[PDB]
Amino acid sequence: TKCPPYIPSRIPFLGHAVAFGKNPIEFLEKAYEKYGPVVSFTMVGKTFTFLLGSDAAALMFNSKNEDLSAEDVYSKITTPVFGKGVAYDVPNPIFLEQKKMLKTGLNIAQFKKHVPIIEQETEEYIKRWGDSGETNLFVAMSELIILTASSCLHGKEIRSLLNEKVAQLYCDLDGGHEAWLLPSWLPLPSFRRRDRAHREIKNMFYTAIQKRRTSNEKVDDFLQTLIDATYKDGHSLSDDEIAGLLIGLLLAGQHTSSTTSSWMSFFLARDKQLQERCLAEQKAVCGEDLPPLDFDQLKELSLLDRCLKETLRLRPPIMTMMRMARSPQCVAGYTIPVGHQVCVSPTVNQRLPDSWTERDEFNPDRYLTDNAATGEKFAYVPFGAGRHRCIGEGFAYVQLKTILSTLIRKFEFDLVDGYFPTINFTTMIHTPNNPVIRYRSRT
Ligand code: HEM
């Protein structure tokens, strides 16, 4: 019973709901100062124990689901979203069976095919912009990412079936507490047409899937990985299971990729020098005529890579990873009891003053010298770390770098009247005047 420091509260049940909810990052920064790397506090009935800093976060990253449980906090968040027999509604071994099926289909051989497809979808979409004007970038990315992701993981049959009609039918699907995401100004009807997309979208897949079943167009696309995929008991995945796995893979990468793409642009629309140094790198690595991209070139676009890593450092779309303690855990000379909701914050760890120089500046060149991203284990964890890591990370870098390149080539970006959008935790539904960006064609 040697429990970590616990921040007390004068408000019985809500605890620190207001203080924390007002600014979670500032709250936790202050808590690390006052209380150390492992602190507890009550919020709306639950005791939360945060692991702050790399050395404390090591507990969760090196943990097993039998001790720190995701299916005890992340299951009824996701199950109404992804479906039955898929995601956190199945036993971990068969859960991890499908995850190993997904990770096989997300390989370099496919990433080489994916880079062309992403550019075509970007070129036909961003033509809507025309010559010059101003767009809502968060909304712009939301729509583009759906198309790009759909035309890579779902196939061409399902892309053919896709129209501007269904793009927001994912929004009601997205609605269904859902994950500690960074708040953003994406289209937020959330309700849209609940219960209706579940029929529309699911049957969109059944039909497309049957075209691949009774036919001999066995191709190398992600869907053909799942149709031919067999469990380790021989039985292959059913019709509804394959659809659930594909729907869920586009949703887990939607807001994440969209929010990051937008923030990086805003960060580059603020610093015009870096936006030029990037364009230099583009025509210098690919040639001045800007020929179509391919996987290989992406690996040497290092400035873009360091801008993306710096974006993910300051604006990680997953704000907090959470687990429920089923067995007592030991960290920093403390024992976390059964029933605590153990939390790691990539945002905090990637901002901690005792680990990052110029913590709040968007400085991509910090990776050219020493930094915590390589010099520490769990100080830079946008995609997670260790045993708990994003399987879409490889597709993410490919998708994001291809998209941003296709943008920085065909456009230049700047802030409208100098407006740089800020995240507000105090505005429940009343966002401050929406985020807009300025675009103008190149040359
Ligand atoms: C900037 C982009 C992204 C970030 C920062 C991100 C972040 C994360 C993180 C931190 C996790 C671990 C959550 C946890 O263990 O509690 C995760 C899991 C996952 N992500 Fe992402 N992700 C991104 C993009 C994507 C993409 C593009 C896909 C799919 C194409 C995707 C699919 C998944 C899936 C399937 C999981 C599995 C959840 C599990 O392990 O049980 N994500 N992501």
Author numbering: 58 to 233, 236 to 502
What did the paper state?
Sterol 14α-demethylases (CYP51s) represent a very special P450 family, regarded as a possible evolutionary progenitor for all currently existing P450s. CYP51 enzymes are found in all kingdoms of life, catalyzing the same complex, three-step stereo- and regio-specific reaction that is essential for the biosynthesis of sterols, such as cholesterol in humans and other vertebrates, and ergosterol in pathogenic fungi and protozoa, whose CYP51 orthologs are targets for azole drugs. In metazoans CYP51 is critical for the biosynthesis of sterols including cholesterol. Binding of physiological substrates, however, causes a conserved conformational switch that involves closing of the active site entrance (bordered by helices A’, F’’ and the tip of the β4 hairpin).
Here we report the first crystal structure of a non-mammalian vertebrate CYP51, from the abyssal grenadier (Coryphaenoides armatus), a deep-sea fish common in most oceans of the world at depths between one and five kilometers. Statistical analyses of the catalytic domains show 80% identity between C. armatus and human CYP51s (90% similarity). The structural similarities that we find distinguishing for both ligand-free vertebrate CYP51s include the “broken I-helix” (residues 311–313), and the “heme bulge” segment (residues 441–450) shifted away from the P450 heme. The shifted heme bulge segment in the ligand-free C. armatus and human CYP51 structures is accompanied by the loss of the conserved heme-supporting salt bridge between the imidazole nitrogen of H447 and the carboxylate oxygen of the porphyrin ring D propionate. There are, however, two striking differences between the fish and human CYP51 structures, and those are in the location of the β4 hairpin (residues 481–494) and, even more so, in the location of the FG arm (residues 232–258). The middle portion of the FG arm in the fish enzyme lacks the characteristic F’’ helix. Instead, this region of the molecule adopts a loop-like conformation and is immersed deep inside the active site pocket, approaching helix I (SRS4), strand β1–4 (SRS5), and “clashing” with the β4 hairpin (SRS6) in the superimposed human CYP51 structure. In turn, the C. armatus CYP51 β4 hairpin is moved outward, away from the active site, protruding above the surface of the protein globule. The distance between the C. armatus P242 and the corresponding proline (ending the F” helix in the human structure) is 24 Å, and the tips of their β4 hairpins (I488) are 16 Å apart (inset). Instead, it is a transient, low-populated conformation common to all CYP51s, which becomes more populated due to the placement of the high-pressure adapted enzyme at ambient conditions.
